[PDB]
mmCIF file of C-alpha atoms in Angstrom:
data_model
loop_
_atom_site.group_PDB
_atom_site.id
_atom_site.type_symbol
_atom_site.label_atom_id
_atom_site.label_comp_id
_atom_site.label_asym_id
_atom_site.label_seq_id
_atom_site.Cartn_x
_atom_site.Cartn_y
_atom_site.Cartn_z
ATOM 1 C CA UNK P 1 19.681 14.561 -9.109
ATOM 2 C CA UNK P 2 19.883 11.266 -6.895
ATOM 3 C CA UNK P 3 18.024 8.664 -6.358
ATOM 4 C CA UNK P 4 14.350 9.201 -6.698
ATOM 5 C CA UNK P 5 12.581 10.049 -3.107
ATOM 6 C CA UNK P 6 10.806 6.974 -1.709
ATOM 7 C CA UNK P 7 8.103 5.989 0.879
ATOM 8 C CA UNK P 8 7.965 3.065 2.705
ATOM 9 C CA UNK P 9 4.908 0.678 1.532
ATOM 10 C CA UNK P 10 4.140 -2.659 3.830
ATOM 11 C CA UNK P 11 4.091 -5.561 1.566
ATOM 12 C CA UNK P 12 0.810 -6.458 1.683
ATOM 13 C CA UNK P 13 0.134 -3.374 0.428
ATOM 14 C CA UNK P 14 1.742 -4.337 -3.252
ATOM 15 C CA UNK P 15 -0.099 -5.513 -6.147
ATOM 16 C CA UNK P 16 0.466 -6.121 -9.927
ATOM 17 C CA UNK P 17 0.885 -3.062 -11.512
ATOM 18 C CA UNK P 18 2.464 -0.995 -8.316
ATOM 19 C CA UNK P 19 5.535 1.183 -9.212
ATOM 20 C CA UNK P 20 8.446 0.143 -6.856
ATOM 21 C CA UNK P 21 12.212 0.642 -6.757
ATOM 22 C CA UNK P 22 13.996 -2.324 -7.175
ATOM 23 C CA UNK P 23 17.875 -2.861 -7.922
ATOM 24 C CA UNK P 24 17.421 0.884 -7.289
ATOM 25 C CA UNK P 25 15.252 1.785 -10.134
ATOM 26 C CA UNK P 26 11.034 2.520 -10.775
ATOM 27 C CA UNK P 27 9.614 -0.293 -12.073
ATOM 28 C CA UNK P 28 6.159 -1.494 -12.695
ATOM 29 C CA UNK P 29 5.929 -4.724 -11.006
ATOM 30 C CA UNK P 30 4.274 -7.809 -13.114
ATOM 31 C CA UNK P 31 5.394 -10.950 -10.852
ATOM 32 C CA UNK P 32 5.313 -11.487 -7.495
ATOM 33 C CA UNK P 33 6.286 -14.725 -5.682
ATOM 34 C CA UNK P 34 7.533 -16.179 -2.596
ATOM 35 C CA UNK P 35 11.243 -17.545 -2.315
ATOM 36 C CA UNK P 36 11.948 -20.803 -1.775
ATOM 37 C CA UNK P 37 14.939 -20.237 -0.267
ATOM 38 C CA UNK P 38 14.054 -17.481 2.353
ATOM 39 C CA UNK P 39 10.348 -17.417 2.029
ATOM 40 C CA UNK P 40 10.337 -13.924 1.875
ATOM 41 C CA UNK P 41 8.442 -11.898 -1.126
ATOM 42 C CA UNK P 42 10.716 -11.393 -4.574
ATOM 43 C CA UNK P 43 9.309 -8.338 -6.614
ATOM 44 C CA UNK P 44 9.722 -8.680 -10.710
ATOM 45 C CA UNK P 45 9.248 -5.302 -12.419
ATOM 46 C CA UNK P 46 10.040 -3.525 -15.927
ATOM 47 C CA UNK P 47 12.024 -0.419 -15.662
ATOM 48 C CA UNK P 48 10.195 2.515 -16.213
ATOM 49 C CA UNK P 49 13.505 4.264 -17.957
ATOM 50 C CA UNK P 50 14.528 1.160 -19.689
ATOM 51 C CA UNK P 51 12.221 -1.132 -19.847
ATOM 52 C CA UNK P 52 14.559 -3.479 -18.948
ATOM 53 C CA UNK P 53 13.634 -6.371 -16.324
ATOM 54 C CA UNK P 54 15.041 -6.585 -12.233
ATOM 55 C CA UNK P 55 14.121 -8.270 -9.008
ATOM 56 C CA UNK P 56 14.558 -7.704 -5.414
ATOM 57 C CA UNK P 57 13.438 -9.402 -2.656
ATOM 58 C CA UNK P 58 11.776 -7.630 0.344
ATOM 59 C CA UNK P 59 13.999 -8.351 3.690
ATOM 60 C CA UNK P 60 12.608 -8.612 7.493
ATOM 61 C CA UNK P 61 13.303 -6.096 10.288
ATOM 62 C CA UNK P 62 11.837 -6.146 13.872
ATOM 63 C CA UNK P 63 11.114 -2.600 14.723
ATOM 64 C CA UNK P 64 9.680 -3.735 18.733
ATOM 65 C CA UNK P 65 8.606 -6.489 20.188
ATOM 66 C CA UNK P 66 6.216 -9.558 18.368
ATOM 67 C CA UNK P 67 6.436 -7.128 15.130
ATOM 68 C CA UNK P 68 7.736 -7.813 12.119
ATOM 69 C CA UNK P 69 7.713 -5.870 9.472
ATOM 70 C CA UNK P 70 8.371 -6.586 5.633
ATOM 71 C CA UNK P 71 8.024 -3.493 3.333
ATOM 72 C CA UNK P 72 9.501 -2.426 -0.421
ATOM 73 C CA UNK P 73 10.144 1.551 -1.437
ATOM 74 C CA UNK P 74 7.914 3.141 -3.709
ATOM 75 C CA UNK P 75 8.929 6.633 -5.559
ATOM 76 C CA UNK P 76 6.983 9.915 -4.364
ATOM 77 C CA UNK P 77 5.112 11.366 -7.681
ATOM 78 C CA UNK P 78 5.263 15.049 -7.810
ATOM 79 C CA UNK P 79 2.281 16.442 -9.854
ATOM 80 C CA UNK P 80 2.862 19.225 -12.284
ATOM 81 C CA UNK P 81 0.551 21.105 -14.630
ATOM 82 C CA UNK P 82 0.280 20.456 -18.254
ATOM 83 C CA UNK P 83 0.467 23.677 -20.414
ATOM 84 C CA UNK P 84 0.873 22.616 -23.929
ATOM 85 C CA UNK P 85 1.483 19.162 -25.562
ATOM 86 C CA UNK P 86 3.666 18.517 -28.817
ATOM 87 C CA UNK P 87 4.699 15.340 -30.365
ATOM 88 C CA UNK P 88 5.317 12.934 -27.737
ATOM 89 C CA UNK P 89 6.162 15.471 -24.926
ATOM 90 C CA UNK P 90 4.849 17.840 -23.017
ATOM 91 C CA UNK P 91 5.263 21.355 -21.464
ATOM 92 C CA UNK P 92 4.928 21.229 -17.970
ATOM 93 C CA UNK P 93 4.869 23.704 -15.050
ATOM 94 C CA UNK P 94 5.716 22.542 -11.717
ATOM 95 C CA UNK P 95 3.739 23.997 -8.272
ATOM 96 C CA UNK P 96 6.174 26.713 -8.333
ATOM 97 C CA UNK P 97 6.411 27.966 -11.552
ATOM 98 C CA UNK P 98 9.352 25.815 -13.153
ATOM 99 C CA UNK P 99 8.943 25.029 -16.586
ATOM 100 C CA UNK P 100 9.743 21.632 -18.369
ATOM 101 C CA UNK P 101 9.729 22.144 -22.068
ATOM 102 C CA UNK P 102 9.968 18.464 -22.742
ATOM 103 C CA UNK P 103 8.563 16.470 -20.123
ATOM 104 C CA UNK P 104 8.602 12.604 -21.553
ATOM 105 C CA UNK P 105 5.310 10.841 -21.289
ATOM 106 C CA UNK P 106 5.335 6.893 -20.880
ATOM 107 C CA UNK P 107 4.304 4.620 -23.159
ATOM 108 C CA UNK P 108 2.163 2.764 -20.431
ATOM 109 C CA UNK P 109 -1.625 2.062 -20.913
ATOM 110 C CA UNK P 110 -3.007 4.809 -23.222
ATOM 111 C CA UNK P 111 -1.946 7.596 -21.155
ATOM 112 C CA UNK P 112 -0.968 10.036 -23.641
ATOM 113 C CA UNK P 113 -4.357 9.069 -25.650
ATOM 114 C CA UNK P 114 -6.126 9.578 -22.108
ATOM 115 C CA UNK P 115 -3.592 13.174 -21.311
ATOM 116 C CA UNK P 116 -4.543 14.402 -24.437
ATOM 117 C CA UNK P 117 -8.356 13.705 -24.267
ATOM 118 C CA UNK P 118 -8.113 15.595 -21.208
ATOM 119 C CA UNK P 119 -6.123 18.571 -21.907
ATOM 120 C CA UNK P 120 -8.527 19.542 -24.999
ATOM 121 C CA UNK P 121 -11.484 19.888 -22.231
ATOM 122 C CA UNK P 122 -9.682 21.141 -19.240
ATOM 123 C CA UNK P 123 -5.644 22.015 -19.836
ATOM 124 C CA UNK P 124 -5.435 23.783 -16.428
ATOM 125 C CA UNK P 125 -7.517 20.999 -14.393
ATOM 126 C CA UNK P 126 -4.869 18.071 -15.984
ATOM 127 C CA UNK P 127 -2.383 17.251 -13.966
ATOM 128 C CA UNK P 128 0.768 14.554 -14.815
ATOM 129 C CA UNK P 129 2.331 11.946 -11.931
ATOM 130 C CA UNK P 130 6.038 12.374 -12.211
ATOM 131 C CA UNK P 131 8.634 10.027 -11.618
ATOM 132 C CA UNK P 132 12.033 12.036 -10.773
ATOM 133 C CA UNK P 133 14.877 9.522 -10.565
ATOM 134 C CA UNK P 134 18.722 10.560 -11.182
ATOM 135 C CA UNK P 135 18.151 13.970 -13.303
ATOM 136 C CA UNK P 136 15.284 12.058 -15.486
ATOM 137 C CA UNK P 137 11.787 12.743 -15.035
ATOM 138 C CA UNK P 138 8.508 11.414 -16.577
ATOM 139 C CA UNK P 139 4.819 11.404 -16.691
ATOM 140 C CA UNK P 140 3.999 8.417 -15.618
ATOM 141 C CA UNK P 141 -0.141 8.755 -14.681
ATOM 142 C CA UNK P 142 -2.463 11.625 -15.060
ATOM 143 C CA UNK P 143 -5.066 13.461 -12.946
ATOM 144 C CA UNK P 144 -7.694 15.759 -13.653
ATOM 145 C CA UNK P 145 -8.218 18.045 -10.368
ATOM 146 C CA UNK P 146 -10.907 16.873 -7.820
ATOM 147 C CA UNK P 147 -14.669 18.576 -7.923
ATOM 148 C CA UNK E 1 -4.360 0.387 25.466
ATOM 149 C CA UNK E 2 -4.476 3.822 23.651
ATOM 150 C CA UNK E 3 -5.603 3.755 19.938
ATOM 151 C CA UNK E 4 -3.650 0.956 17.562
ATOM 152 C CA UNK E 5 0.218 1.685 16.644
ATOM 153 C CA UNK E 6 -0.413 2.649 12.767
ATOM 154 C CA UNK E 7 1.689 3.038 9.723
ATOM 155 C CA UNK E 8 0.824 5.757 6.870
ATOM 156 C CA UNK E 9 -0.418 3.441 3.495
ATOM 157 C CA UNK E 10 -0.481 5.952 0.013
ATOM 158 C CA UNK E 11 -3.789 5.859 -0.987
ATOM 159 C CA UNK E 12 -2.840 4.187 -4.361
ATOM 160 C CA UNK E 13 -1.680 1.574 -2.350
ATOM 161 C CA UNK E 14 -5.439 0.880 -1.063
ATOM 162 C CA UNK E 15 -7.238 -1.729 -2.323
ATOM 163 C CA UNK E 16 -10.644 -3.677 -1.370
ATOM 164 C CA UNK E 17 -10.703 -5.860 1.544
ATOM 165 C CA UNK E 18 -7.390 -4.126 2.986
ATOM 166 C CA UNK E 19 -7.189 -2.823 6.590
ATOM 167 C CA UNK E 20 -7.349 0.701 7.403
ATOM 168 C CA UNK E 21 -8.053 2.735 10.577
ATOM 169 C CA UNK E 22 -11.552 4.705 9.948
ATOM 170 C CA UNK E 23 -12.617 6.956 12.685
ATOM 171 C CA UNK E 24 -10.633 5.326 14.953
ATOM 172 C CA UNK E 25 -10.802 2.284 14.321
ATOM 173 C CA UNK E 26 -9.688 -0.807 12.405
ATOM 174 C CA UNK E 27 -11.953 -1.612 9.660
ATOM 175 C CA UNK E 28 -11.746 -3.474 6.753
ATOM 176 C CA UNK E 29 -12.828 -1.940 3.471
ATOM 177 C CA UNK E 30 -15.980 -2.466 1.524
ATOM 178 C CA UNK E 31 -15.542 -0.068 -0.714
ATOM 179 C CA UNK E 32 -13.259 2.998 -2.286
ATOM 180 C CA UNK E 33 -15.547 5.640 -3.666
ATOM 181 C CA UNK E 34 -14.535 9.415 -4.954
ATOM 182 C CA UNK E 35 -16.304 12.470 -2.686
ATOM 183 C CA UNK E 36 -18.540 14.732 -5.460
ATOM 184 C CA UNK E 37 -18.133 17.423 -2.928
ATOM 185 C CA UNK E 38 -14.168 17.120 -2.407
ATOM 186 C CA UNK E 39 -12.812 15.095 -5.050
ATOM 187 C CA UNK E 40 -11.084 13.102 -2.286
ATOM 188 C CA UNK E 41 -11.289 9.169 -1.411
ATOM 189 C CA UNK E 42 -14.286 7.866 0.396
ATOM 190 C CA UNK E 43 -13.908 4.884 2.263
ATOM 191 C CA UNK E 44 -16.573 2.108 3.791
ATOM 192 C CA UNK E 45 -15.310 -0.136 5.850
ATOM 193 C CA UNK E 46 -16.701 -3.038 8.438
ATOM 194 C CA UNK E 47 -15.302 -2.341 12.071
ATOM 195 C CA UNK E 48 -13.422 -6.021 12.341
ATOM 196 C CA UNK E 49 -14.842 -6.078 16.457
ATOM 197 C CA UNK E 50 -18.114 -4.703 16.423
ATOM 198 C CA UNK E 51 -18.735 -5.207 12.779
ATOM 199 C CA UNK E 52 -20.408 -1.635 12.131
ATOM 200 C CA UNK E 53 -19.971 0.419 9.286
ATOM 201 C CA UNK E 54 -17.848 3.327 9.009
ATOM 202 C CA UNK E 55 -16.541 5.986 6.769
ATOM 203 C CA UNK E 56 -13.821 8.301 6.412
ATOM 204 C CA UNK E 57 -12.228 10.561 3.720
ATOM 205 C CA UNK E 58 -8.472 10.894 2.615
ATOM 206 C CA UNK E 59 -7.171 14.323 2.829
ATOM 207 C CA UNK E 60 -4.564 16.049 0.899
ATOM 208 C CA UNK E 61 -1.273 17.487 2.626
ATOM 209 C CA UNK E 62 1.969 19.289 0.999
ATOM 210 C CA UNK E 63 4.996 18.212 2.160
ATOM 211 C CA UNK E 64 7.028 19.601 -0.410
ATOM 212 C CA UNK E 65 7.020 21.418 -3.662
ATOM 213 C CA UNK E 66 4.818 19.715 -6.092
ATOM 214 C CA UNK E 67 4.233 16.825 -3.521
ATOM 215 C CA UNK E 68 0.863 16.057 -2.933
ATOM 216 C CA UNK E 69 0.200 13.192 -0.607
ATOM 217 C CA UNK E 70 -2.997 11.378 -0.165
ATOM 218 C CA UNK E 71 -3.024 8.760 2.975
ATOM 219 C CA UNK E 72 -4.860 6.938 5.198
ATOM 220 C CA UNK E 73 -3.603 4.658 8.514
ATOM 221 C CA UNK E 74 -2.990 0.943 8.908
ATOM 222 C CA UNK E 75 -2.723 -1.033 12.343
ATOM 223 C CA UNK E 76 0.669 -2.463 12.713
ATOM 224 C CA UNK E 77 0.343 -5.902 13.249
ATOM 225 C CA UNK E 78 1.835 -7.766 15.839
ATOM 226 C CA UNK E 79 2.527 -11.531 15.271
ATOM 227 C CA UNK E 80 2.112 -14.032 18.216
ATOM 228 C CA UNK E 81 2.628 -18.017 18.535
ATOM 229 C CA UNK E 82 -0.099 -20.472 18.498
ATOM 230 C CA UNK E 83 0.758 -22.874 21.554
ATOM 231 C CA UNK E 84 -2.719 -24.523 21.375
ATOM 232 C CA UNK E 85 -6.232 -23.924 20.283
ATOM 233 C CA UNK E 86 -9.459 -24.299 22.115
ATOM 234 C CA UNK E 87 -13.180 -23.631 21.654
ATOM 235 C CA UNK E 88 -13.167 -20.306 19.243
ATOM 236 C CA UNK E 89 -10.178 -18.881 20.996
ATOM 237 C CA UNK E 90 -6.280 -19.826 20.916
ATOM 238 C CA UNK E 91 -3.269 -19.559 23.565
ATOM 239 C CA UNK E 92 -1.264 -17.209 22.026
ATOM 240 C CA UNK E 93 2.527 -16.209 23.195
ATOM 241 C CA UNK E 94 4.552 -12.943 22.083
ATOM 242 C CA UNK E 95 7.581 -12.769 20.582
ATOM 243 C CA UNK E 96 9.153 -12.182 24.374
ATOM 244 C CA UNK E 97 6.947 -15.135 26.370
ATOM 245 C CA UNK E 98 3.595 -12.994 27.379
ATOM 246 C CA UNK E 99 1.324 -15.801 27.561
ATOM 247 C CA UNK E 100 -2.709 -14.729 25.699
ATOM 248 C CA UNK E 101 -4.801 -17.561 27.018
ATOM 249 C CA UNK E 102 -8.089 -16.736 25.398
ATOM 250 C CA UNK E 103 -6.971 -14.754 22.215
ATOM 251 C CA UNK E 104 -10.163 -14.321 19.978
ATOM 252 C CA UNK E 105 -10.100 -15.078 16.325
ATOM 253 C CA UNK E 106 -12.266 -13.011 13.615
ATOM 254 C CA UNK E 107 -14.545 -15.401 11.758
ATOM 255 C CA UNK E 108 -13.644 -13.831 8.478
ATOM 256 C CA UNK E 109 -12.504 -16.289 5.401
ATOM 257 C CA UNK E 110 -12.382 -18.937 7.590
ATOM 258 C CA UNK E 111 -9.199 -18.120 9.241
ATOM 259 C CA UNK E 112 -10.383 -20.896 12.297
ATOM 260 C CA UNK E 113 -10.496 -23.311 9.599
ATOM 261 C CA UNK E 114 -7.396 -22.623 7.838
ATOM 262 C CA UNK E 115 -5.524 -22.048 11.433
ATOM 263 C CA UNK E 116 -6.588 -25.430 13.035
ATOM 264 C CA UNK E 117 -5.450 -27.120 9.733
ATOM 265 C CA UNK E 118 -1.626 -25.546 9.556
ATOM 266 C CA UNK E 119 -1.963 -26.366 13.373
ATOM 267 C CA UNK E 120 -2.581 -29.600 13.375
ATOM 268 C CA UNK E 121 0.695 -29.681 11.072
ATOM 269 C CA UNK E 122 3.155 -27.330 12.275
ATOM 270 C CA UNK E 123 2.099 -25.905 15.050
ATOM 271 C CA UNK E 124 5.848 -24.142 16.069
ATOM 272 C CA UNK E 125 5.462 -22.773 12.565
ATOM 273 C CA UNK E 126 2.193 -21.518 12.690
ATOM 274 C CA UNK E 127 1.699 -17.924 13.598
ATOM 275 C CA UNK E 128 -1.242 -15.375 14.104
ATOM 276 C CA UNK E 129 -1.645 -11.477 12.822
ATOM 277 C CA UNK E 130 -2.669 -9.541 15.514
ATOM 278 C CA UNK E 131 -4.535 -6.617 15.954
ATOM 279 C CA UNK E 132 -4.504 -4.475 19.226
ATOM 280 C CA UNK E 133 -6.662 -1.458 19.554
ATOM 281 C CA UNK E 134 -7.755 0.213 22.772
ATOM 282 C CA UNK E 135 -7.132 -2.824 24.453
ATOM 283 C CA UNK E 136 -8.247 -5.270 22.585
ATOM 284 C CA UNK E 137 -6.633 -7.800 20.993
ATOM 285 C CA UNK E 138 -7.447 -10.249 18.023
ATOM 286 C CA UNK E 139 -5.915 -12.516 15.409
ATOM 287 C CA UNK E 140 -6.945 -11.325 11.927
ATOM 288 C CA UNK E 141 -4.788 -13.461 9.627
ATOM 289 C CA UNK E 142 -2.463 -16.811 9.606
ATOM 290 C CA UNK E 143 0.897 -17.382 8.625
ATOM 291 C CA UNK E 144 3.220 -20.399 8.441
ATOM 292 C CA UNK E 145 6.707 -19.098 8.856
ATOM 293 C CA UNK E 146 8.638 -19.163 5.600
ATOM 294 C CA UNK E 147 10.945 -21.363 4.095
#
């Protein structure tokens, strides 16, 4: 598996708490700032593999004429359905049929608490935001399936 | 002047106050609710020229396996020069020299105010966010270029 697929998000479209790839990785962003140096946007984020901390700073291109354009990557979430749920992981089922015995959850604001709550009223209405980056994967947000 | 060039903005990338195109035109939104009906996002949002309200729902599409995209449209913006300022309207020049003598400006967080002021301090560096729709033409934000 390569890189994870992306969309292209303008920057003032980014807020705290938006997943981007930066240095070439998801990451939750917590900082954003302006550089002195270029004046152009830097993005601070924690790794959602690693946890660990990178930056990157967004970069100006002139598609036509009087517009500029400044924009960051953002992964594409696929959405699979949850099945079962064991100990930290669970079974998911993507749209067409694969199964992924041990899909990871994230750590990240209650989700599994919140997955959980869910899947005890609902199991085939849940639904898990995946993160597919270079062969790893992750639930990284939930959704119950629209009325 | 057909319909204003657009870009496609993920719909967790949407956020109060942001710019969006809602039945066809550029509006800025009031407010993100969910559709009991459809599940889908509702959005309000104030027409930024006539100022009337309008609404329009998000709409799911599958691109690929297990890829389920939610978006709405955002006017590109085009960013002119401020050569001088007059009366409730500006001279404004393109990137390539088209002279806008009487370019209107949106009375909307006092971005007069704020524009005069950088202006009267700057004025090369001072620069207007433009939208064009159908014709029309109209600076809805400032920006000093960078550092």
């Amino acid at each position: 598996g390569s890189a994870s697929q992306t969309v292209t998000i303008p920057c003032h479209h980014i807020r705290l708490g938006d997943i981007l790839i930066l240095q070439g990785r998801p990451c939750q962003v917590i900082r954003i700032s302006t550089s002195a140096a270029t004046g152009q946007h830097r993005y601070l984020g924690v790794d959602l593999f690693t946890k660990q901390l990178h930056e990157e700073s967004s970069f100006v291109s002139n598609p036509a004429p009087s517009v500029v354009v400044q924009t960051m990557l953002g992964p594409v979430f696929k959405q699979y359905r949850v099945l079962d749920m064991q100990d930290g992981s669970i079974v998911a089922m993507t749209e067409t049929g694969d199964v992924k015995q041990n899909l990871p959850v994230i750590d990240q604001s209650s989700l599994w608490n919140r997955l959980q709550k869910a899947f005890e009223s609902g199991r085939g209405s849940v639904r898990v935001l995946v993160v597919s980056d270079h062969g790893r994967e992750m639930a990284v947000d939930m959704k119950v399936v629209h009325g």
